[PDB]
Design a protein around this ligand. Structure first.
Ligand code: CL
Ligand code: ZN
Length: 179
């Protein structure tokens, strides 16, 4: 995703935790399409005010009660997994920063289509032409992503976000919007 196309998939102005890039399944080192993002709280916590947000405007796909996709321009799409309280149905037009769901606050709901999770979060992925895309060299909220390690690697020489020449390791990020 080129610089300016996508914002972080959480509210503009909010400050959420961003983990290391990983493949969709969490094993291997390619394509590292995915990032886990959360605000806080474990299983059972109140996530009803924690709003997973559309990375860009596009067309909504509600795959299940825990899994959504937004189809953007240019063959790009973003996907959002481990959800509850999805706010749109398939075919809806959503905007950049539209609140689309909460992170599922129970494991059974978070894993409604399989997988594993240690706690409430969104598993966000970038796709191009319907295939998982490798995040190295892509942009998110104006940060250039470097991802050259294995899944979930947070070593700050192999996973970091770069903006205005400064590198930033994994951790909490305030969402400025797409730039
Ligand atoms: Cl709708
Ligand atoms: Zn994940």
């Amino acid at each position: 995703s080129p610089n300016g196309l996508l914002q972080f998939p959480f509210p503009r102005g909010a400050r959420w935790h961003v983990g290391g890039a990983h493949t969709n399944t969490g094993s291997g080192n390619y394509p590292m399409s995915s990032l886990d993002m959360s605000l806080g709280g474990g299983w059972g916590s109140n996530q009803s005010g924690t709003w997973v947000s559309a990375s860009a405007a596009g067309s909504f796909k509600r795959h299940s009660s825990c899994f959504a996709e937004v189809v953007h321009s240019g063959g790009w799409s973003t996907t959002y997994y481990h959800l509850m309280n999805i706010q749109y149905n398939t075919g809806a037009n959503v905007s950049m920063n539209t609140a689309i769901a909460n992170p599922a606050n129970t494991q059974a709901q978070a894993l409604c289509n399989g997988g594993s999770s240690t706690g409430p979060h969104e598993h966000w992925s970038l796709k191009q032409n319907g295939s998982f895309y490798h995040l190295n060299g892509t942009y998110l909220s104006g940060y250039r992503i470097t991802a050259t390690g294995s899944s979930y690697d947070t070593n700050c020489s192999r996973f970091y976000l770069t903006k205005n020449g400064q590198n930033y390791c994994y951790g909490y990020y305030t969402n400025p919007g797409p730039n």
